[PDB]
Amino acid sequence: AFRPISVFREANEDESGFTCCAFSARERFLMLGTCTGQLKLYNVFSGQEEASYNCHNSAITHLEPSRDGSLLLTSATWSQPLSALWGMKVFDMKHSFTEDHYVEFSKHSQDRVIGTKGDIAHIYDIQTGNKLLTLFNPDLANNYKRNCATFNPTDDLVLNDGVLWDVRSAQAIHKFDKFNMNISGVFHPNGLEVIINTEIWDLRTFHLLHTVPALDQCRVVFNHTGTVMYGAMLQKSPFGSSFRTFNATDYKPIATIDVKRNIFDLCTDTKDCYLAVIENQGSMDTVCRLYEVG
Amino acid sequence: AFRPISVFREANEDESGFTCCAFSARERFLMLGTCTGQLKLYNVFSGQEEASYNCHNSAITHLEPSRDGSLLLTSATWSQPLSALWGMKSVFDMKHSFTEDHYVEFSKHSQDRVIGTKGDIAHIYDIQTGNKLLTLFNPDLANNYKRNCATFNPTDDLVLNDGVLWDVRSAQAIHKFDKFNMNISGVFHPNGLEVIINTEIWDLRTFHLLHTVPALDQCRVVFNHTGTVMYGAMLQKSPFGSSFRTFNATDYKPIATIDVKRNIFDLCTDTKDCYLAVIENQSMDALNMDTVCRLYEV
Ligand SMILES: Fc1cccc(N2CCC[C@@H](Nc3cc(N4CCOCC4)ncn3)C2)c1
């Protein structure tokens, strides 16, 4: 049950150019990246645009606010810096990650950033911005075209290019075998499973647990309690006109939602009451439609 | 860093009698056994008691909730029965007893069986019927470990009992690991490839010695749920002293040595491995039993 509420659109523009969405830490703001590298803040209540910040010189591809509301990670498409860390408590650049096309925070304590440059993962200290670790084992590389390195929920492990790393020893534990060209995978928020495209792997024994065909070429996001998984399939619009929900315990579908328009991105708020979806109104005119979750 | 978050005692008792603990399937709720045979449910953050159940007429030594929240194993000191299986669905009720076993745990992959230990002997039981399916003891291969604790491997194909590897389907001993200590019988690595018997790390394929880790000596070793950290409390009334040790599960390198300067009765982690609960007595080798639960954020 996804009940459309409202639309956020770019004020003072013929066509809308939203490319990515994230709710602010305490959800008073929807943060919308644009195709020209602006970060626009919208009040969820009033629907009004409160600020437009010049973050990058190309389309924003990724946004992640820190849980404490003090920091924001951004990634763009081309040029430099590809990724940056911003203070949210005046809006200022804290550090740049010049060559990393994707960045995420550590999960348990958000003291670190993990960046991806092709097949290579970099870990940075938030305070200093210094590079602490480079994770790349050329013996084990899968060369995934959409590789995105990520920490597990405890920050002890990293998944990079389908390879599981022990962060403390900076050594590869296991290479998961390649069965697609693009998707490198994520940790299940439950901490026990690795989800790589259609393959569900046991984190501890590395045995295959499940095949989930409906996840093929999907971006996967979880609700904040990790009971529901969202998948939007990659096809310019990154995804198509539908997303799918899955029970995160058994990987069985809950709903296929056809919005009848190409999806650029989707995110949930911390309380799992809202779904924001970037939808192409044109045939870009990419608006952000808000849905009640339920 | 282990950051103390909360401390609490057994509510309203002159002397606090917590002896063991395990996190519930419910996020912020810890189950605790007591020296008078009660099972307590506490809010681990507020320290407030929620529920109490009468399980045994002697001290609870160990408890293990099932992953699905439906079942609980308990073991007591000198009660009859020594161990029992409880339903927690609607009414809290005893399903089955394991008369002679001083320790019990669930099978690992599918929790459809219980494995109990009586000295050097392992018993395997069906959860549905309570029926004893197997008695595992080989008089030729016994190591006679004083703190023997029989266990299934991650896939439930194998059992380690008194340092002997058993094929469960055939109920035959397939290998005896040579004895290097008097007490510690060992556990499976959650990766399913290694057996950890006191200071010895054995390869499950070749049965070759992979590593010797002196810092593990006389430790009850447990893994966090993710299998990234090994926690060891050393034997020295509590069986344990005032220290617990952590090791990297991938390379067995020590991480931390934590001396709480009080005897430890038990320790456990939450399903998300964010927290460590420790039961500690309030001087060293205190005759007085007055324990607290301390919660650390990891
Ligand atoms: F050295 C080992 C090796 C393997 C397992 C253990 N454990 C298994 C769980 C139970 C442990 N024993 C106790 C005993 C105990 N007390 C309660 C008070 O009366 C004395 C026994 N309190 C807590 N734990 C021993 C010890």
From Swiss-Prot, chain B:
Superkingdom of origin organism: Eukaryota
Sequence motif DWD box 2, location on chain: 200-207
Stated role: Acts both as a substrate recognition component of E3 ubiquitin-protein ligase complexes and as an atypical serine/threonine-protein kinase, playing key roles in various processes such as cell cycle, telomerase regulation and histone modification. Probable substrate-specific adapter of a DCX (DDB1-CUL4-X-box) E3 ubiquitin-protein ligase complex, named CUL4A-RBX1-DDB1-DCAF1/VPRBP complex, which mediates ubiquitination and proteasome-dependent degradation of proteins such as NF2.
Full-sequence portion shown in this chain: 1079 to 1389 of 1507
Tissues where the protein occurs: Ubiquitously expressed.
Region (WD repeat-like region): 13-212
Assembly, per entry: Component of the DCX (DDB1-CUL4-X-box) E3 ubiquitin-protein ligase complex, named CUL4A-RBX1-DDB1-DCAF1/VPRBP complex. Interacts with DDB1; the interaction is direct. Also forms a ternary complex with DDA1 and DDB1. Interacts with NF2 (via FERM domain). Component of the EDVP complex, a E3 ligase complex containing DYRK2, EDD/UBR5, DDB1 and DCAF1. Interacts with DYRK2; the interaction is direct. Interacts with RAG1; the interaction is direct. Interacts with LLGL1 and LLGL2. Interacts with histone H3.
Modified residues (Phosphoserine): S238
UniProt domain comment: The protein kinase-like region mediates the threonine-protein kinase activity. The DWD boxes are required for interaction with DDB1.
WD repeats: 13-52, 55-96, 98-135, 137-169, 170-212
Family per record: Belongs to the VPRBP/DCAF1 family.
Compartment(s) where it occurs, according to its Swiss-Prot or TrEMBL record: Cytoplasm; Nucleus; Cytoplasm, Cytoskeleton, Microtubule organizing center, Centrosome
Inducing or repressing factors: Up-regulated in a number of cancer cell lines (at protein level).
Motif DWD box 1: chain residues: 164-171
Name by which UniProt lists this protein: DDB1- and CUL4-associated factor 1
